[PDB]
Each structure stands twice: as structure tokens, then as C-alpha cells.
Design a protein around this ligand. Structure first.
Ligand SMILES: N[C@@H](Cc1c[nH]c[nH+]1)C(=O)O
Ligand SMILES: N[C@@H](Cc1c[nH]c[nH+]1)C(=O)O
Ligand code: NI
Length: 465
């Protein structure tokens, strides 16, 4: 049958939709709302919604949607799914300040205590995908969604087997089966594609694009997106002072990284957000300056006889991150910083031990749904789900909290720019590059998604000629 083999980086433990975006990526689960190819929020599972006042969201769900096990998608099922996800995930919890949910038939009413203009947008987050909470199986193993492909088998951290859900609401899915295997090394993912072990791969190393373009049996897609690579500091280690972060920021050669590590498939970064976004007021671009870094390190007593030691974590999934780490190590030596690079296979798990790292290479989708609030809440607030280094500044918190209740879109842009300006002074993280989305496939594979948010991949139209 029409079977598709996919090789993905970033192995998962739990496959519950509130633990990872993989279920949405591979076509197993769907959120109430979704972004279209142009990045705009649209109803997906929702027929109609209204906001009669600024604390009330009334949703009417479509009446023709079933979960993969044949159960009807109803307002009660959505209520139970959202409530379970909020209680089991801080990412979900902190993004959804929901005070109550009522459900009757296909009608759902979601209330908040104060205005939260980004509520609809966050209900499009793949971590908010809807699953059947009454399913008897473990949601961490075989969640039941409404997507075109049902997860039938999961070998933890290794492989996911999916089968066509013939009654999928949007259309009869075009593939019979999908097999997803994890592979952290991008060079191995490319070899898998070249040997036909796999048919579709993500996160293609830049240094392999030309080879794929040359092959008439393969195709590579390279698109502008909203993913940013960065050096993330562990603020809980007292040695990681403002001067140390500033020194590290000046050791990075963003221009050189974009040109030679990313081979032009990236632009140097300033803030978390891609500079192509026209309302973003970016901080000034940092140029590498080893002498300035040495001077800043002298402020804390670091010299050649007594250098600063930094344990820098990296991971293979995003192939350029470890290449950047190597360059930072070499350049930092010139400034009296000895960097030890530790590559780990489970980055999210590893970083939980606050004593195990000083800084980490990282990559994140910083503006997946057209608003900067999400990033600020998840990265710059204490206990936000990607704030692994625990950056927090009361002055920044106040602005983020203000932003969260700000209705006027223009005022939101202004407050957001104020947050960027103020936070930038602290160097919470050093944003390195805004890098392009590179996906490759056998030429026989058609209609997979390579859109700027980098979340979606498989849908009901994806096929093998
Ligand atoms: N946010 C990082 C680490 C990660 C692992 N799994 C999911 N995310 C990245 O996407 O590269
Ligand atoms: N891997 C996705 C989602 C994520 C949540 N936490 C870590 N990663 C990203 O980096 O954008
Ligand atoms: Ni991630």
C-alpha cells in the first residue's frame, strides 16, 4: 500500500499531545484552531466562534467530526481534553488562563477572569490538540485524536506506527500507513533518504542541500520561517553574571555563523523574533569583539591564568547547533573562556537538572501564531516551559503581565517592543540566527507542508504519487 516512512529529529518520551507537537506534525491530532499557509489563525475543528465580551469565548464545534476510535467530537470531549492538558502541562497551563469551561452539545463557552486577547491564538498551539480523554489507552502511548492518521503502535523514543483513519472529517486520507522513526543525526537522516529507508525528512543539514538538489529522485524545500537558534544561559548559576553573558554575546560572530555555518540559509539575529516582521523594533546587531569580551571578563577576575569555565550543552537534532558550539569554543578561548561542549541525546530532559549546565545551545519557534506574547510568557517568565535557565526580572514581568491584558493590537506591538528593549539589556539569551526551514523528500512524495511556523507536516492530502 501507499506507505510513508518519515525520519524526524528530537525523540520523544511521552507522545501525549500536551507533551510534544509531534502528534500534530504527523497527522494524529488537531487543535481547535490552526494557522493557514500565510500564518493567520483560522477555525479548524470549530464551525463558528464569538466573543460577546472580552472575557467570554463562545465556540460551536463542527458536527461532522469523529475521533479515530469513532467517538463523536463534542463540546464535553473538548472540555475534558483542554482541562486534562492544562493540569498535566505547565506549557498549556500558563498559556491558557481559563477560569471556567461549560459544555452542552456542540457548544463550548470558555471564560477568563480578565481580558486575554491571545486566547484564540493559543488554542491553535499544537500542545492544545484535542484527544479523547475517555479512551481506555494511555494517552502517553497511543493518544486518540481527530487527525487523518491514528497512532497504532509506539516504541518509546524510537518509532511511531500510524494507520489511515478512513472517516477523517476533511477527506479520505491518501496514505495507508505512516512509520515515523527518530534519528538525531541529520547526516544519518539524509543517508536514510538517499538509501530509500525513509521518504521524508526534516531538519536537513545545510551542508547536504546541494547534494539533494542534484538528485532527480529527491526534492528539497527551503523556506523563510520563525525558528531562532540561540545560546541560552543558566541564570541559576551565580557565575553567569550580566558581564559574563555580555562577554559571551560578544564572542559570537553572528555574521560568520549565518554565512558559513548556515551557508546563507539564515540571517543574524538580535531579538528572539525574525527581523522580517515589520513592527518589531530590534536591538542593535552585536558584532564579534574579542577584546571587549576580555574586558568584560576582567570585571569578574577571569584571566588566562584563571579563566572562566563554561559547560555548554548541545544536541544533534538541529544540525547546525553543534557546529555553532564548536566555533564558540574556539573563539571563546581567545577571550579566556574555556568551554566544555557536552552533546546530549535528550535535551529537554537533560536541562531539568539545573546543576548540570552553565549554558545550552537551543532552538525555538519564537512566534508561531503572529504574536510575541507566547514567547515572553514561556521564555521570560519564571516557570514558563521553555525558560530552562530561569531568567526573570520583575520589571520585565510587569510589562509581560500588562501585555497579556492589552487589547489594542498597536499597543500590544508597543509594549512588546518595550519588553524587547528592556530584556535585551539583561542578555537573557543570545539570539544567534533566524534560520530557514529545510525539508527533503523522495520526489514521489507530494503535498506535505513546509510552512513558516515549522509545526505542520502531514495532512490528509499528503501522498505518494
Ligand atoms: N526546543 C528545542 C528542543 C526540543 C526537543 N524537543 C522539542 N524541542 C528544539 O526544538 O530544538
Ligand atoms: N519543538 C518546538 C516546540 C517546543 C516546546 N518546547 C520545546 N519545544 C519548538 O521548539 O518550537
Ligand atoms: Ni522545541
Amino acid at each position: 500500500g501507499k506507505d510513508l516512512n518519515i525520519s524526524l529529529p528530537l525523540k520523544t518520551k511521552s507522545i501525549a499531545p500536551y507533551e510534544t507537537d509531534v502528534p500534530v506534525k504527523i497527522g494524529a491530532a488537531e487543535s481547535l484552531f490552526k494557522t493557514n499557509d500565510q500564518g493567520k489563525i483560522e477555525k479548524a475543528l470549530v464551525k463558528s466562534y464569538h466573543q460577546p465580551n472580552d472575557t467570554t469565548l463562545d465556540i460551536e464545534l463542527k458536527d461532522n467530526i469523529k475521533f479515530q476510535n469513532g467517538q463523536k467530537l463534542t463540546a464535553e470531549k473538548v472540555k475534558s481534553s483542554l482541562e486534562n492538558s492544562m493540569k498535566k502541562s505547565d506549557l498549556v497551563k500558563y498559556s491558557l488562563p481559563i477560569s471556567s469551561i461549560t459544555a452542552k452539545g456542540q457548544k463550548l463557552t470558555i471564560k477568563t477572569n480578565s481580558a486575554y486577547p491571545e486566547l484564540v491564538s493559543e488554542l491553535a498551539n499544537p500542545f492544545m490538540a484535542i484527544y479523547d480523554t475517555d479512551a481506555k489507552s494511555d494517552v502517553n502511548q497511543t493518544p486518540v485524536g481527530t487527525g487523518p492518521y491514528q497512532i497504532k503502535d509506539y516504541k518509546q523514543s524510537r518509532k511511531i506506527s500510524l494507520s489511515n483513519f478512513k472517516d477523517y472529517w476533511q477527506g479520505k486520507p491518501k496514505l495507508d500507513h505512516i512509520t515515523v522513526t527518530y534519528q538525531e543525526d541529520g547526516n544519518n537522516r539524509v543517508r536514510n533518504l538517499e538509501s530509500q529507508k525513509d521518504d521524508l525528512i526534516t531538519d536537513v543539514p545545510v551542508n547536504k542541500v546541494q547534494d539533494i538538489e542534484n538528485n532527480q529522485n529527491l526534492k528539497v524545500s527551503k523556506e523563510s520561517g520563525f525558528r531562532t537558534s540561540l545560546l541560552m544561559y543558566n541564570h541559576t548559576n551565580k557565575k553567569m553574571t550580566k558581564s559574563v553573558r555580555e562577554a559571551l554575546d560578544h564572542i559570537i560572530d553572528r555574521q560568520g555563523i549565518a554565512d558559513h555555518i548556515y551557508q546563507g540559509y539564515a540571517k543574524p539575529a538580535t531579538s528572539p523574533f525574525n527581523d522580517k516582521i515589520p513592527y518589531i523594533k530590534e536591538p542593535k546587531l552585536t558584532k564579534q569583539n574579542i577584546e571587549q569580551a576580555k574586558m568584560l571578563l576582567a570585571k569578574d577576575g577571569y584571566t588566562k591564568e584563571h579563566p572562566l569555565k563554561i559547560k555548554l550543552i548541545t544536541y544533534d537534532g538541529r544540525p547546525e547547533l553543534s557546529k555553532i558550539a564548536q566555533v564558540l569554543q574556539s573563539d571563546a578561548k581567545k577571550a579566556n573562556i574555556e568551554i566544555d561542549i557536552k552533546s546530549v541525546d535528550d535535551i529537554e530532559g537533560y536541562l531539568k537538572d539545573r546543576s548540570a549546565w552553565d549554558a545550552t545551545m537551543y532552538s525555538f519557534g519564537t512566534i508561531p501564531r503572529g504574536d510575541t506574547g507566547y514567547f515572553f510568557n514561556q521564555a521570560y517568565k519564571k516557570d514558563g516551559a521553555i525558560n530552562k535557565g530561569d531568567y526573570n526580572n520583575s520589571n520585565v514581568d510587569d510589562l509581560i503581565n500588562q501585555l497579556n491584558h492589552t487589547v489594542d493590537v498597536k499597543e500590544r506591538h508597543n509594549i512588546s517592543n518595550d519588553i524587547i528593549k528592556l530584556s535585551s539589556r539583561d542578555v537573557p539569551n543570545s539570539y544567534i540566527a533566524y534560520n530557514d526551514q529545510i525539508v527533503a523528500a523522495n520526489s514521489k512524495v507530494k503535498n506535505y507542508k513546509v510552512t513558516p511556523e515549522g509545526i505542520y507536516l502531514i495532512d490528509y492530502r499528503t501522498t505518494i504519487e
